[PDB]
Design a protein around this ligand. Structure first.
Ligand SMILES: [Cl-]
Ligand SMILES: [Cl-]
Ligand SMILES: [Cl-]
Lengths: 650, 651, 658
């Protein structure tokens, strides 16, 4: 089968294969995996465990696993994982040398030629977790590729107006280098197998998104994947907001996928002993929350790392969904309920389309690159540190999640700026500190054609060369109908108190003051102009150059950001989309459609039972899924702590 | 030459710091006050730098002057072999830099030992100051080559017998053999020129560096084992109010290493940290008394303070000294002098001390520390997921027992005698000893089968010596434990294990272990999960609780529940025959000893308040032999003041 | 000198002080925006600008010099009658914000020679050129010992010095070769830059701006720099250099930074080359945007401390990467922020009070707080570079004297802040003079003989913390034979480490002193002992010739710092001052937390500067000296009744005494 947007979603798990394991233990795993309503496994095709002393390939260890998978009707995601040190847990991200590249060619020839013949092979994973924060610039292969890339690019030290510039050669090379290696791996597989889906799992996306050109990857993939691990990738969130983290991670991959189907290649299946940055053992409740969040965001699968554990050194007896007796943990029991639900609701679950509110939260590579130059790699967890340009849009995302509104989370190049009408569409640019003339023209077009643009923090302070048009002649003056006057540093947390008394917005670190020309000024209680609304063609701009999303984050209170944002949304979004009648702290809802029927996903992450009033769209709430006996009266849902609910609208 | 033995009269002593610039008059002033302070012994760093002449010959003058003044005041000398090194190298190099350097060290030893062996007041050669370091010189050619050779001579496979991947810990096993080799080589060099004098060495920072030290091997070339036990360097795992427990554990660890050899504490902190030390202090007079008694009660044949007098330049200039800047007694030297005086007035008692072994042994192994260093990737976040949990865990059990007034051994697993036919009324505690191999598991099976009680908490036995988890592949301790692990689930740094029927609410650290029993009796918590078991195995028993409850005690700063639970598991004979407290006392310690058939107890109060301690077990009525704040007993109820040290003689 | 001077202004101690600003020139700026800057700068009562003469923005592909970009700026400055401080800033990476501190190589040195030849030969011809800044911000915490030029200079310096591993008595020593080389290396490079400029221009003032002075003072030999400078400068940035202080004490930080530069200047005039003019976005260690009130506070503090100028970094902002749209006094519309409006009031005040403002002499109380290079160097060796902000960390040797300085500021008393070599030990009379040596842990035999002479001739010496524990070779005479025994009439017994904050509980009168980290006990011979409640001797007063010594070897200045309370240190210090200081100097009748006063004289008239940094209106009773308070300057309507000044939060006041 070739995956499509109409495929039946699956629940699956990594089957960890290494020497020493017995036939009987491996059969025990596939048997329990099949009994757990899981259809799919993923296997790391370790070159180390196939290479013989003579340099031939012995496939025996993996044949045994593929044959047992086949016997239990389990399909396999096979990860290309060439020979590497036992201590290299995640795998090398690029060849070490030309000689190493040839060894990888030989690995792919042998492994793809052999395992392509199994009728239960579902997908090739080109590489595990492309991208690293520590790129191997010291190694000869990378050193040479970077030297060649620089020779083929012609950068000037000055812009057209004559101002000095940064060119971000390293960052632009790294995008092209990822594009090149993944495309090369896809071409290598395609030498031997044109039949099977090609897949890859970008990881740590709130940090590594600046490495990833998903639109290019679409050209050589059949599906986009992702590792979304609560213990590795969600450090910007408390555990009670891993719902929001998973929703944003799902939205980010969904945006990257474009017209391709996507699935989550890795979810955390088990316990951190010594591993992980933010260690946990997922609850049964978290397992259910993550699977539903992903399916509600169009995922065609959720694969857990891992069914069974590694036995030696790094992650030995960690991450596993099965216990040390090879029986179901409460996490596998939980995952099995979702597999069962899918088998009983195939037509619904196979045709999920996320109900787009029309709100898109946009991030760009360049804001992250400019931030890394300006903060000089500081990790003090504020606006003056690496991560503020992602924490800011994630904070708006959280505010909308706590309003029960869906929002896209997209790289700016993944947004379609080519349409003739953007009536009732919303773009949020939250502390996207780098914008160039081309994207500003796209934003002007978007707003002119009826779009609503919300911009906070230092959005557009710099261009793509770290040149500040705020200093030289502000590129967004036309769209904003206003001009920045000053930024003044304040405390980590201050209040922006609007003159009309309607709003007291938590704000982080810097207070922006502006001067309006065409825009309507918004004054604070100090008599300073802190924001404006510009009518621009059929659309509008709300600009508040203080970081109010980071303010919400620092105050741990998204309520004011919710209320303000709702007041700016086109009426059609609030009328046509199910959402909460007001802000609910630590509650999320996202809606989806399947074959003309609308559904809503609701999760309560508060310490108490909540009664959530759902308004907007049409229909009466029928509870289709609830793991703690939720009930609805009219469109008022009573939902318990850690409960996941699916409402079908009739 | 007088040879140290287990019957030697213990001494109080001090480093005499000799460097150029000192006058005859000031050095005589030191030896005179040292003798007047009831100290019999000094230690002198025999700096190669201060004997080498421009021509490369040896001029012994500076050290002759010190040895002759020591001799005049009847002071014996521990002479530390300390070849030429940079002025800024405070502690000394731990291995030769190069083959050429090794030959310079040979020449140093020839000259210094040939000359100073002739002094009748020479008591011992200290082969090297403070063997071992956290920063081992793998960068240097001598070490790099020895390591390459060692690896070639060892036959390591990347897979175990069952076929699983393994780690072989080549570096760690090499470092053990490398220390064994260099110290044995230094002993052989000294013995070329002097067969008469005791050979001694002072391992240091033992709660961190014990993984470098093979004490059973060192016994083959030593006459005595030493130690540096400095409150400002080595006790970072403890608050200052528990430096009693730290010193007791450090003494027990060296005593275990010593085996049949006598041991003494080569360095104790004698004075103030100005700029030096990790956990700086100036010991109180009360701490000086506490440390000397703890060491003597743990069979120490000496306590030598670093230092009598101070260095004058740069590192530790005017620091560490027992004398003040006028070269008169601080309250620390006055305090040490009372203990020297006590020894001279109680020779027969103080010369024949044997620690009263409760029969409780807390065991650590090199391999748990090595596997921890691989799994934590050197993280220093002070939890179970950091370097040091495998030592902090057993030290926490040690503290819980100290606060119950029970002695406990603190031993490397190879220092425990597993060869006996009977272990009735013996107890082994394996607290978060995360690495155990098949050989040690068979020894533990034998120990328990023959009547031993085994207490195991935290991740004990989660890995083998190759960092392979038999918990994953087929649990090697299933037979002994009569049970099988089910899961670990990470929780907060501090949570409560609430036993069914409210029998116990145990503080626990970081991970909750659940198990399944076969032969063992399960113990359930209030959530209906199986969190522990008792297995009857031959004549003995196993108590297994795979959650870290010793680290739980540490994190909660409360050892009371760990005390109560441990007491409930002890053979009756231990509680009947050993003096101990009738209940747990926070910040109080007691350890008992015997001399010539008479039993004694050492009690120290580290709480902020006067404590009334009810002592039970063993036989006899309290006679207070030593009490520096006028402690009094009513029956066997001891009223002891804050910071007081008490010795009871049981009549 | 007058024939050499030619048309060029020579700055002097009688010059009219100016307010000025950096004019940031880079390619891409338009003629129109640069003219807009000079026009607003002139309208803001500023007479002076400073310009970074970037080699990068003059070098052509062929290696010739194109001066066009800077010609445009100099001509627009000239049109608006603005004089220029021109900073020699050779070609360096765009990302090198502050500039290289030494040549990378012999080849680089030749490139610098060529840069200086071209730039000085050309811009010396502008009649509005006021000064050459030889280098921006000499000194760095990261000295380039890795680079071949520095490596070779260090090797040569070591060969030309003869150090023994042992002192005369035979004790081991440290020689601090690196630190002594670094002093001589700064002396050499700055002197070499001055010589290079003087090849082509003998007419214009030579200037330099040492920076981060509470950390980098150990790099700086100001007495030597005097031999090739016409004025000493300084960068004193609230966001970079004042980390040892909370923001509410940046008054004290600026006063101390001004005193430190004033001491370095000796007979030369000084001015503050950089003050923070605007906002930190991503830049700075302690980021802020100065208030209008802070701008006024800083200018008056500097002028009251004899500054002949205050130049703000920056009038306009950089446009790209580091500090893009940061530091600027103008807003993004190129109009006045409240900071430029504030600075303009001070420029206006100067124009209306030329004779007063041109002749300021600080009213020296006779209190000198002394620091030495060697205490900082010995501290760096003993703390092994630890940064835990206590006595056992880098910085205690400067935080201690700064704490005494703050105590005196909060008593309304002026105090000098001087390197020990900047103190004149040559006089016959030191009656009514006071030296404070606060945790100056390194003193040599030569300085001890100077201190003995100072006290014998009527000087009062106050010494706390580990003052004199070590000599200049990190050898402790406390261990070998205490070199200060004669002067102190006493001998140290012990140090015992305690908590970060403990109390010294005196025997008498239930008196208490906050103390930091270590308790010092002593034994008196000639001195009168002071005992604590434990019957230990914790301090003494030695009567020595006509003078006296107060010694308390516990850190009580650092105790005041840790407790955030300088009241007891104020009271104790006042009780030790010669009566003549309290009789002749305006000061507060008692300690005032978060208030400062410093007094100055101009043409025989006395003035006082008062700043309130408390959250509340304060009524400050001023006593000492003569005259009735007339309020000459007040930005929040201060009023005086007799000599009782009512001053509002963040207000700056100048009193003229009648
Ligand atoms: Cl994989
Ligand atoms: Cl020694
Ligand atoms: Cl400049």
């Amino acid at each position: 089968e070739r995956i499509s947007k109409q495929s039946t979603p699956f629940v699956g798990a990594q089957i960890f294969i290494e020497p020493g394991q017995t036939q009987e233990q491996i059969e025990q795993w596939f048997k329990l995996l099949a009994e757990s309503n899981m259809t799919t496994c993923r296997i790391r095709m370790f070159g180390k465990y196939m290479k013989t002393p003579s340099g031939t390939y012995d496939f025996t260890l993996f044949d045994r696993a593929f044959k047992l998978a086949d016997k239990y009707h389990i399909k396999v995601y096979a990860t290309l994982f060439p020979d590497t040190e036992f201590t290299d847990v995640g795998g090398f991200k690029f060849p070490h040398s030309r000689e190493h590249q040839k060894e990888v060619e030989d690995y792919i020839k042998n492994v793809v030629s052999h395992f392509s013949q199994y009728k239960n092979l579902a997908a090739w994973v080109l590489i595990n977790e492309p991208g690293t924060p520590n790129l191997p610039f010291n190694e000869p292969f990378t050193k040479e590729r970077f030297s060649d890339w620089k020779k083929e690019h012609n950068f000037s030290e000055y812009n057209e107006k004559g101002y000095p510039v940064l060119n971000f050669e390293k960052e632009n090379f790294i995008i092209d280098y990822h594009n090149w290696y993944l495309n090369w791996l896809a071409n290598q597989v395609r030498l031997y197998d044109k039949q099977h889906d090609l897949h890859v799992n970008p990881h740590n996306v709130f940090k590594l998104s600046g490495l990833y050109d998903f639109p290019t990857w679409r050209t050589f993939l059949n599906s986009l994947g992702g590792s979304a691990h609560a213990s590795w990738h969600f450090g910007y969130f408390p555990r009670k907001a891993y719902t929001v983290a998973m929703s944003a991670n799902a939205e980010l991959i969904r945006s990257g996928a474009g017209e391709l189907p996507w699935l989550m290649t890795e979810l955390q299946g088990g316990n951190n002993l010594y591993s992980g940055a933010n260690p946990l053992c997922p609850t049964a409740e978290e397992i259910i929350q993550w699977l539903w969040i992903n399916f509600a965001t169009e995922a065609k699968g959720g694969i857990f790392w891992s069914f069974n554990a590694r036995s030696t050194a790094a992650e030995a007896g960690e991450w596993a969904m099965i216990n040390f007796k090879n029986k179901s943990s409460d996490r596998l029991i939980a995952a099995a309920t979702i597999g069962k639900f899918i088998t009983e609701n195939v037509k619904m679950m196979s045709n999920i389309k996320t109900l787009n509110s029309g709100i898109s939260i946009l991030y760009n590579h360049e804001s992250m690159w400019v931030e890394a130059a300006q903060t000089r790699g500081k990790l003090n967890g504020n606006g003056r540190s690496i991560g503020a340009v992602m924490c800011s849009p994630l904070s708006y995302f959280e505010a909308l999640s706590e309003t029960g509104l869906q929002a896209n989370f997209k790289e700016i190049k993944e947004f379609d700026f080519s349409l003739n009408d953007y009536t009732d569409q919303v773009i949020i640019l939250s502390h996207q500190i780098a914008l160039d003339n081309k994207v500003i023209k796209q934003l002007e077009s978007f707003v002119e054609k009826g779009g609503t643009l919300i911009a906070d923090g230092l959005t557009g302070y710099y261009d793509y060369q770290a040149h500040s048009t705020v200093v030289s002649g502000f590129a967004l003056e036309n769209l904003f109908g206003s001009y920045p006057i000053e930024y003044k540093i304040k405390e980590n947390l201050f209040s922006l108190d609007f003159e009309k008394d309607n709003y007291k917005l938590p704000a982080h670190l810097w207070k922006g003051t502006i001067e309006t020309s065409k825009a309507t000024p918004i004054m604070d209680k100090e008599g300073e102009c802190i924001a404006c609304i510009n009518q621009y063609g059929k659309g509008k701009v709300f600009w508040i150059p203080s970081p109010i999303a980071l303010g919400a984050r620092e105050s741990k209170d998204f309520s004011e950001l919710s209320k303000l944002t709702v007041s700016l949304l086109p009426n059609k979004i609030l009328n046509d989309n199910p959402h909460f009648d007001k802000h609910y702290k630590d509650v999320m809802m996202k809606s989806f459609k399947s074959n003309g029927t609308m559904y809503s996903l609701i999760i309560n992450k508060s310490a108490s039972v909540q009664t959530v009033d759902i308004v907007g769209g049409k229909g009466k709430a029928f509870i289709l899924f609830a793991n703690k006996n939720a009930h609805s009266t009219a469109n008022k849902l009573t939902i318990s702590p850690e409960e996941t609910v699916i409402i079908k609208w009739k």
